[PDB]
Amino acid sequence: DVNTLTRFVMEEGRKARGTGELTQLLNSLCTAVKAISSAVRKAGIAHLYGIAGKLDVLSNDLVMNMLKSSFATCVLVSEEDKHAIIVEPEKRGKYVVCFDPLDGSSNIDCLVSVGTIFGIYRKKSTDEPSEKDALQPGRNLVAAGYALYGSATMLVLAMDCGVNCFMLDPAIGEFILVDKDVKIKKKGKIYSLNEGYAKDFDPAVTEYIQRKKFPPDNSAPYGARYVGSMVADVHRTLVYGGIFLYPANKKSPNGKLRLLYECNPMAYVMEKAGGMATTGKEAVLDVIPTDIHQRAPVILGSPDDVLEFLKVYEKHS
Amino acid sequence: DVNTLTRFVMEEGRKARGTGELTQLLNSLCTAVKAISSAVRKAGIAHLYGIAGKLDVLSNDLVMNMLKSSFATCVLVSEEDKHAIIVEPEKRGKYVVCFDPLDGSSNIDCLVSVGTIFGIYRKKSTDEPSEKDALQPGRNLVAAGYALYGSATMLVLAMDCGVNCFMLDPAIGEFILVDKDVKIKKKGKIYSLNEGYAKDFDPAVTEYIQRKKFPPDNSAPYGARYVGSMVADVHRTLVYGGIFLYPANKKSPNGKLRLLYECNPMAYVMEKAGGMATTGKEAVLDVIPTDIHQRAPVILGSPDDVLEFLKVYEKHS
Amino acid sequence: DVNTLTRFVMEEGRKARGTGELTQLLNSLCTAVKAISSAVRKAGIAHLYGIAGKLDVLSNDLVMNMLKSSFATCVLVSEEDKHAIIVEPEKRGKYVVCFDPLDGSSNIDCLVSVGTIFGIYRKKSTDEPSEKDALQPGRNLVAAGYALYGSATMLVLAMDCGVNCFMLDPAIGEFILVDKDVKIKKKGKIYSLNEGYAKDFDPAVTEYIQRKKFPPDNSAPYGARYVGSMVADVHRTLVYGGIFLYPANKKSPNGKLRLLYECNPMAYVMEKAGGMATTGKEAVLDVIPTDIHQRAPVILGSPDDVLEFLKVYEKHS
Amino acid sequence: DVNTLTRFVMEEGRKARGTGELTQLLNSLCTAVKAISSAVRKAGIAHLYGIAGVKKLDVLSNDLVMNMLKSSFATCVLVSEEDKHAIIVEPEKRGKYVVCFDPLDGSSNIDCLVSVGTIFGIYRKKSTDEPSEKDALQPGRNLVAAGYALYGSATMLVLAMDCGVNCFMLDPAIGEFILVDKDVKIKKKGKIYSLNEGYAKDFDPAVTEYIQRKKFPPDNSAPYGARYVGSMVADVHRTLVYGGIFLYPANKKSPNGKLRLLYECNPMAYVMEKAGGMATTGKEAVLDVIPTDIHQRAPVILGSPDDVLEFLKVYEKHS
Ligand SMILES: O=C(Nc1ncc(Br)s1)NS(=O)(=O)c1cc(Br)c(Cl)s1
Ligand SMILES: O=C(Nc1ncc(Br)s1)NS(=O)(=O)c1cc(Br)c(Cl)s1
Ligand SMILES: O=C(Nc1ncc(Br)s1)NS(=O)(=O)c1cc(Br)c(Cl)s1
Ligand SMILES: O=C(Nc1ncc(Br)s1)NS(=O)(=O)c1cc(Br)c(Cl)s1
């Protein structure tokens, strides 16, 4: 039986006997994703080039305006805005959303895969909304996921029921469910990190990657892949297994990716998919943020591969 | 003044006072790319999943049929067919086309970028058309390029007049000229290869990569990127500069990429953009093929980066 | 603030504190309508014509399948099925849907406007669902409307809250609310009927039409428009005012249009839009059907015009 | 074997050993029509309604056609329903063709989403003077090519040349015009008449009697069906596909009719004749009228020949 994203969320919402606010939020978000996808695939570019005589800015506005007008949110955190956005009172709902509206867009001149990442928290207190309502550990996530604008557009949605993958059919503007209850392989064969930074690697990372290239036993060395666009590298890791690393070094003691709207939603998808996600010293989802734009190192993927990393990591501790 | 692909090709054809066959071939090829792109982005996937109750094969069929019916071709070589296809006498024209109808499609389950690669030769001999007509060196290419199905779908077309880039506007199904007479950077800051084969690397490749991670002049190390899809990796190399390497390993002692419809067309685009493409021992375009599916090692990209590799290569004889 | 059809229905439905069955129904129906529009604008026709080497039947299948899999219906009546379809028990909901999946389709060979018409009733008894559950007067409509596949695609939805018009943005596959709580003009300037049956007209129709062409008060005569596709002629009456007639003649004492899935939903849209809808002797919504395909004569549109028709009809006892 | 418009025109051009200017022209026109269709189906309308927090359609259509023709290097004079004067292409972009067009006909009723269309006619420049408005004053007989786009339930391009009439379906999934009807011919006689009967008070007596004959046939045969969309391209295209007769005739208040000869009547008459139909003003063939003003009007009755003849017989009966 065919299933769409909207149909699916509605059916889960009725099972749970909820009020509907989250379904309205997710429906708005889904619509924002279709418009972003359309602009990313360069719909209307002929008009820009004079046939009749901003991509991350538009991305941010699409998500921002669709979430605000959903009547389901009260605080919004974005890669693009220095401060949390507080929804005006008439539109205030009960959810906090952190998002990266177009991750990887810094290299979009080469038409690399890009994506939107989002995380949804229930607002916990009844105080007047403020930036502080976004400083929750990822463990508190109600829902998280990403859309990948790759060879095709896919929406990956993680909730407590698990991880589900939806393909955008552009002929009809619908997300079709194509992977139910996805789980990552226990062990993979691919490692993903920018090896041009080798001069600066923490000694444990240097030893870990060296073992993937030169296994002590007779196993085959791992393949390397690194798109440089997080959503694409994480989705490959999810679909094929393995390990993704953007680790900490002495130049970056807290890593580079932002915890709220990059590391946590990926850590959440990974954990709902049976994988792992650590900073080296703790699970990414247990980190308690103090700044909405603070960074975190992240190592995520297949459990055996992440467990092996932590073993090399503790060897150097 | 705005320009489309078909408009651009027609204007060159009349300047060149030619018969139109290459225009018809190129026009047909362009139609195939729009169908492939439509298919790669999953238009109509909802019907396959039962809303009303293989991708590399289809791409090959679209290209074959559009070329055959162009009346402009006589021999077709495809990554997907063990033998050259001989066009029937009534449809025979004067051109030989080597193409990969969907390169990278082996990893499309993760929505990696994919692309179509093509090279167009004039038939050289006067014998009956046969497989022998495709065994020409890349130096003999009349036209070459690729369609990249990435965040957007872009067509890169290379001829003697230089390199030109056309963006597919999917709202109207037209290729829009967006980059005229492209030239690659003299020196880039990114190197690209699968470093998991390090156990098998040639000493010259090993030394070259170390100089990228640990520069002798203590200048900044290069960034690493490796998508694993040749069209995406080479296109990034063209847009941002740098160097792409797929050298030989123990599983691939003659390298892995195919000379006729992968290495030569990319080498031609690179050279027409002012860049370089070498096997280590000779220019890719100077290799005389003996087998239509034969492999080649290739190092290509910015001239300063490619020369430095060759300087290291000669150090190791 | 921007609104889509699904967001609009969710917000009304939450206001009404309902179970969600109707929203699931309306969303499924929206998905079917987007699919039909894609087929109607001939997406993919290149494949039927051999690029790689039914319409009303497909339309009926799309509606049937989205309705069956919506978990909101139990009885379906279609222009295309002699008998009502009884939803299988595990998919049963409480709603009865009567629809014409592609009316006007016999003349789609000239690319005339076509459309989907639908009316939604709540089920009657709790015994076996059966064909009798569709034999309700139009007065019982819970919701009704149509999609028009014209120069653009528009969905018109009528409920207790009023009539609203949604434009399908084909770039993103969303219905955007563009006309809130719409009302028909009190009096229009266009009459619409097939004047080729004039030899068979009821004397009242003859006198009414003569009054439009040769106005007694020397006002300007009405313009005539008749596309031959009911959804197209009816939408024009809604948008611009005027009167649409498919009257009973000497040959067809109960007219030609079908009461359940053509006349009733248009009368319902007309009444909720401030217009009128008569058979000549009674309000269309007051007719109690006895057979699911029974026909009814219909005169609908701007009230002053329909009253003017009724006044001539009453004169002819 | 599949055929697209761009492929088909290239092939015909190579058979005829032409220079390519007409093919560059038609390809440019073809692109404009895909752009109009996209806007007519309302792509991107969510942005106009604030999904992230420009012009009117007949203005945008005219700019699309104007700009593509100018950049085609194939034109020298452009006449449009929307511009009082002929546009004379700048010397650097000048070609040898004169194009008359209605960029978005029927647009007065596009608010109800009725079918609309683009109409075009292409003449060769005859004289050797510098290009001017006068180079467009040619009879329809001089047409090199003519046709229309119908933006209906699907988008179709009907293109007529000496080789005949061909119909192309736009596949919006890939943006190509697919050949779906080769060498089209109209029925000898139809069953549909098409005109605005709301003007009946003012009909010329020939129109009144002829229409009266369609509703109440003398040989107690079945009456004709009526259709009138009110959009010329939709009504004319239906006449081609199903046969029949289309009338926008002259009355005493409009002795030269309302539709424009250069960019509405002539291109439709040219298609009708190439498909085996007829097109008359009542007194002469539309294609034989010599225009004196680029925006002058003409009466037109066109369609299946047997039906047009019956009209002309009724017309002559009323002298
Ligand atoms: O959406 C609802 N209820 C509904 N009532 C009617 C319709 Br129709 S949907 N509840 S919810 O808390 O938002 C939710 C969404 C998901 Br997915 C969950 Cl799991 S729980
Ligand atoms: O295309 C033509 N001639 C034409 N005449 C009129 C039109 Br319109 S096209 N010749 S060609 O040999 O195919 C060619 C394409 C390119 Br690009 C070249 Cl350089 S040479
Ligand atoms: O839709 C709901 N409930 C919902 N709860 C949460 C979400 Br989210 S939708 N009920 S209904 O009876 O279907 C209905 C549709 C319309 Br439109 C009405 Cl007015 S009432
Ligand atoms: O276009 C050409 N020749 C060509 N040369 C190369 C290519 Br490729 S096409 N001739 S033309 O005069 O424009 C013309 C179009 C039609 Br349709 C005619 Cl009949 S004649």
Q: Residue A61 is nearest to which of D53, D63, D67, comparing CB atoms?
A: D53
Alpha-carbon distance A215 to B189, whole Å?
A: 30
**C193 residue type, one letter:** L
Domain harbouring B117, CATH code: 3.30.540.10
C15 lies in which domain range?
1-181
- How far, rounded to the nearest angstrom, does the alpha carbon of residue C82 sit from its chain's CA centroid? 19
A172 with A191, same domain?
A: no
Nearest to C154 by CA among D40, B79, B292: D40
E strand or H helix at B11, and its extent?
Answer: helix B5-15
Q: Residue B284: phi, psi to the nearest 5?
A: -55, -40
Q: Residue B240 is nearest to which of A110, A168, A198, comparing CB atoms?
A: A110
Contact call for D214 and C196, based on CB within 8 A: yes
Alpha-carbon distance C74 to C78, whole Å?
A: 13
Burial of A250 by CB count in 10 Å (0-12 exposed, 13-18 middle, 19+ buried)?
Answer: exposed
The stretches of chain A forming alpha helices (DSSP H) are: 5-15, 21-40, 45-48, 55-68, 203-213, 230-240, 264-272, 303-315
Whether the Cβ atoms of residue D61 and residue D68 lie closer than 8 Å to each other = no
Chain D: give the shortest CA distance to residue A16, in Å.
Answer: 30
Whether the Cβ atoms of residue C292 and residue C131 lie closer than 8 Å to each other = yes
Residue of B nearest to D43 (CA): B171
Name chain D's partners: 3 or more CB pairs within 8 A. Answer: A, B, C
Domain harbouring C240, CATH code: 3.40.190.80
Nearest to A272 by CA among A121, A153, A165: A165
Structure tokens at C83: 């008998």
Burial of D202 by CB count in 10 Å (0-12 exposed, 13-18 middle, 19+ buried)?
Answer: middle
Spatial CB neighbours of B208, under 8 Å, sequence gap ≥ 6:
B308, B309, B312, B313
Q: Which of B148, B163, B181 is the last residue of a domain?
A: B181
Q: Residue D124: phi, psi to the nearest 5?
A: -85, 140
Structure tokens at A44: 């209307």
Reduced to 3 states (helix: H, G, I; strand: E, B; else coil), residue A59 is helix
* DSSP code at position B172: T
Please state whether C200 falls in left (phi above 0), alpha (psi between -120 and 50) or beta. alpha
**A272 residue type, one letter:** K
Contact call for A52 and D44, based on CB within 8 A: no
Q: What is the largest CA-CA distance in chain D?
A: 66
Helices A264-272 and A230-240, interaxial angle, to 10°? 10
How was this structure determined? It was done by X-ray
Long-range pairs of C74-80 with CB within 8 A, sequence gap ≥ 24? C74/C123, C74/C129, C74/C133, C75/C123, C75/C129, C75/C130, C75/C131, C75/C133, C75/C134, C77/C131, C77/C134, C77/C260, C77/C261, C77/C292, C78/C261, C79/C103, C79/C258, C79/C261, C79/C262, C80/C56
With beta carbons under 8 A apart, name residues in chain C contacting B61. Answer: 52-53
Residue with CA nearest ligand 3 atom 15: C13
Alpha-carbon distance B229 to B223, whole Å?
A: 18
* DSSP code at position B247: -
Alpha-carbon distance A193 to A202, whole Å?
A: 13
Whether the Cβ atoms of residue A124 and residue A100 lie closer than 8 Å to each other = no
The stretches of C91-245 forming alpha helices (DSSP H) are: 203-213, 230-240
Whether the Cβ atoms of residue D153 and residue C41 lie closer than 8 Å to each other = yes
H, E, C per residue of B119-157: EEEECCCCCCCCHHHHCCCHHHCCEEEEEEECCCEEEEE
For B302, how many CA atoms within 13 A lie in the half-sphere containing its CB?
19
Whether the Cβ atoms of residue B251 and residue B244 lie closer than 8 Å to each other = no
Alpha-carbon distance D49 to D137, whole Å?
A: 44
Alpha-carbon distance C292 to C84, whole Å?
A: 8
Residue of B nearest to D178 (CA): B31
Q: Which of A133, A148, A181 is the last residue of a domain?
A: A181
E strand or H helix at B14, and its extent?
Answer: helix B5-15
With beta carbons under 8 A apart, name residues in chain C contacting B46. Answer: 35
C28 with C144, same domain?
A: yes
B40 with B99, same domain?
A: yes
Q: How far is CA C76 from CA C64, C83, C126, in A?
A: 8, 9, 16
Q: Residue B51 is nearest to which of C35, C43, C53, comparing CB atoms?
A: C35
Q: What's the gap in Å between C93 CA and the centre of ligand 3?
A: 14
Whether the Cβ atoms of residue B142 and residue B121 lie closer than 8 Å to each other = yes
Q: Does D35 touch chain C (CB under 8 A)?
A: no
Q: Which of B159, B181, B203 is the last residue of a domain?
A: B181
- The sign one gets for the Cα dihedral C182, C186, C192, C193 is positive
Q: Does A65 touch chain D (CB under 8 A)?
A: yes
Q: Does B141 touch chain A (CB under 8 A)?
A: no
The full DSSP string for B36-85 is HHHHHTTTTHHHHTTTT--HHHHHHHHHHHHHHTTT-EEEEEETT-SSPE
Indicate if ligand 2 lies below 6 Å from the C-beta of B21.
Answer: yes
Around ligand 4, the residues with Cβ closer than 6 Å are B 20, 23-24; D 9-10, 12-14, 16, 18-23, 161
**C4 residue type, one letter:** T
Place of tokens 């300037």: C189
Burial of B91 by CB count in 10 Å (0-12 exposed, 13-18 middle, 19+ buried)?
Answer: middle
Nearest to B10 by CA among B21, A277, B146: B21
Outline where DSSP puts E strands in C104-252: 114-122, 143-149, 153-159, 162-169, 174-179, 190-192, 223-224, 243-246
**C143 residue type, one letter:** A
How many angstroms is the resolution? 2.5
Q: What's the gap in Å between A271 CA and the centre of ligand 1?
A: 23
Structure tokens at A24: 């309205």
Indicate if ligand 3 lies below 6 Å from the C-beta of C164.
Answer: no
Alpha-carbon distance D149 to D104, whole Å?
A: 9
Structure tokens at A172: 């009809």
Structure tokens at C143: 């919701």
D140 with D190, same domain?
A: no
Domain count of the fold of chain C: 2
Residue of A nearest to D171 (CA): A171
Alpha-carbon distance C285 to C302, whole Å?
A: 16
Reduced to 3 states (helix: H, G, I; strand: E, B; else coil), residue A233 is helix
Alpha-carbon distance D29 to D233, whole Å?
A: 17
D45 with D62, same domain?
A: yes
Strand A114-122 relative to strand A141-149, pairing? antiparallel
Q: How far is CA A89 from CA A64, A72, A85, A86, in A?
A: 15, 11, 12, 9
Residue of B nearest to C169 (CA): B171
Residue D90: CB atoms within 10 Å? 9
Strand A114-122 relative to strand A85-86, pairing? unpaired
Reduced to 3 states (helix: H, G, I; strand: E, B; else coil), residue C17 is coil
Whether the Cβ atoms of residue C117 and residue C262 lie closer than 8 Å to each other = yes
Nearest to A118 by CA among A237, A226, A9, A231: A231
The full DSSP string for B279-300 is -SSSBGGG---SSTT-EE-EEE
Strand B257-258 relative to strand C276-278, pairing? unpaired
Q: Does C197 touch chain D (CB under 8 A)?
A: yes
The full DSSP string for B176-232 is EEEE-S----SS-SEEE--GGGGGG--HHHHHHHHHHHS-TT-PPPPEE-B-S-HHH
C227 with C158, same domain?
A: no
Name chain A's partners: 3 or more CB pairs within 8 A. Answer: B, C, D
Calculated CA dihedral for residues C45, C49, C52, C54, nearest 10 degrees: 50
Strand B174-179 relative to strand B162-169, pairing? antiparallel
Nearest to C212 by CA among D211, D225, D196: D196
Residue A90: CB atoms within 10 Å? 6
Spatial CB neighbours of D184, under 8 Å, sequence gap ≥ 6:
D158, D164, D165, D166, D167, D240, D275
Q: Residue C247: phi, psi to the nearest 5?
A: -90, 170
Whether the Cβ atoms of residue C228 and residue D238 lie closer than 8 Å to each other = no
Strand C114-122 relative to strand C143-149, pairing? antiparallel
Place of tokens 């179970």: C19
Indicate if ligand 2 lies below 6 Å from the C-beta of B164.
Answer: no
Residue A239: CB atoms within 10 Å? 20
For A52, how many CA atoms within 13 A lie in the half-sphere containing its CB?
22
Q: Does C18 touch chain A (CB under 8 A)?
A: no
Place of tokens 């599949």: D2
Alpha-carbon distance B101 to D283, whole Å?
A: 60
Reduced to 3 states (helix: H, G, I; strand: E, B; else coil), residue A114 is strand
Contact call for D51 and C2, based on CB within 8 A: yes
Through-space distance between the first and last CA atoms of chain A, rounded to whole angstroms: 52
Whether the Cβ atoms of residue A267 and residue A246 lie closer than 8 Å to each other = no
Q: Does C140 touch chain B (CB under 8 A)?
A: no
Structure tokens at C27: 């969303």
D166 with D197, same domain?
A: no
* DSSP code at position A8: H
A22 with A159, same domain?
A: yes
Q: Residue A122: phi, psi to the nearest 5?
A: -70, 130
* DSSP code at position A221: P
Indicate if ligand 3 lies below 6 Å from the C-beta of C200.
Answer: no
- The sign one gets for the Cα dihedral B213, B214, B215, B219 is positive
Structure tokens at A281: 């010293």
Alpha-carbon distance D175 to B157, whole Å?
A: 20
Place of tokens 């666009």: A229
Alpha-carbon distance D118 to D269, whole Å?
A: 15
Q: Does B65 touch chain C (CB under 8 A)?
A: yes
Contact call for B52 and C44, based on CB within 8 A: no
Burial of D209 by CB count in 10 Å (0-12 exposed, 13-18 middle, 19+ buried)?
Answer: middle
* DSSP code at position B88: P
Q: b/e for C273-295, b at 16 or more Cβ within 10 A?
A: bbbbbbbbeeebbebebeebeeb
Q: Does B43 touch chain A (CB under 8 A)?
A: yes
Whether the Cβ atoms of residue A99 and residue A76 lie closer than 8 Å to each other = yes
Ligand number nearest CA of B30 is: 2
Structure tokens at D71: 């950049």
Reduced to 3 states (helix: H, G, I; strand: E, B; else coil), residue A198 is helix
Reduced to 3 states (helix: H, G, I; strand: E, B; else coil), residue B244 is strand
Strand C73-78 relative to strand C95-103, pairing? parallel
Alpha-carbon distance C27 to C157, whole Å?
A: 12
B122 with B246, same domain?
A: no
C209 with C289, same domain?
A: yes
Q: Does A16 touch chain C (CB under 8 A)?
A: no
Burial of A140 by CB count in 10 Å (0-12 exposed, 13-18 middle, 19+ buried)?
Answer: middle
Q: Does D175 touch chain C (CB under 8 A)?
A: no
Structure tokens at C160: 């207790």
Alpha-carbon distance D300 to A284, whole Å?
A: 77
3-state helix, strand, coil in chain C (%, to 5): 40, 25, 35
To test the contact with chain B by mutation, choose from A49, A59, A106, A151 the residue with the greatest count of B C-beta atoms within 10 A, namely: A151
With beta carbons under 8 A apart, name residues in chain C contacting A14. Answer: 19-20
Structure tokens at D188: 């000898």
B124 with B27, same domain?
A: yes
E strand or H helix at C47, and its extent?
Answer: helix C45-48
Residue A293: CB atoms within 10 Å? 16
Q: How many CB pairs lie under 8 A apart between chains C and D?
A: 186
- The sign one gets for the Cα dihedral D38, D41, D45, D46 is negative
Alpha-carbon distance C304 to D83, whole Å?
A: 40
**A204 residue type, one letter:** A
Ligand number nearest CA of B10 is: 2
Contact call for B172 and D38, based on CB within 8 A: yes
Strand A141-149 relative to strand A153-159, pairing? antiparallel
Spatial CB neighbours of A132, under 8 Å, sequence gap ≥ 6:
none
Ligand 4 pocket test: which of D7, D22, D26, D159 has the largest number of ligand atoms within 8 Å of its C-beta? Answer: D22
Residue with CA nearest ligand 1 atom 12: A18
H, E, C per residue of chain D: CCCEHHHHHHHHHHHCCCCCHHHHHHHHHHHHHHHHHHHHCCCCHHHHCCCCCCCCHHHHHHHHHHHHHHCCCCEEEEEECCCCCCEECCHHHECCEEEEEEEEECHHHHHHCCCEEEEEEEEECCCCCCCCHHHHCCCHHHEEEEEEEEECCCEEEEEEECCEEEEEEEECCCCEEEEEECCCCCCCCCCEEECCHHHHHHCCHHHHHHHHHHHCCCCCCCCCEECECCCHHHHHHHHHHHCCEEEECCCCCCCCCCCEHHHHHHHHHHHHHHCCCEEECCCCEHHHCCCCCCCCECCEEEECHHHHHHHHHHHHHCC
Q: Could you tell me the strand order of the sheet in which D75-80 lies?
A: D87-88, D75-80, D97-105, D116-124, D143-151, D155-161, D164-171, D176-181
Strand D164-171 relative to strand D155-161, pairing? antiparallel
C14 with C130, same domain?
A: yes
Place of tokens 């492999």: B295
Chain C: give the shortest CA distance to residue A123, in Å.
Answer: 21
With beta carbons under 8 A apart, name residues in chain B contacting C32. Answer: 51
Alpha-carbon distance C224 to D234, whole Å?
A: 15
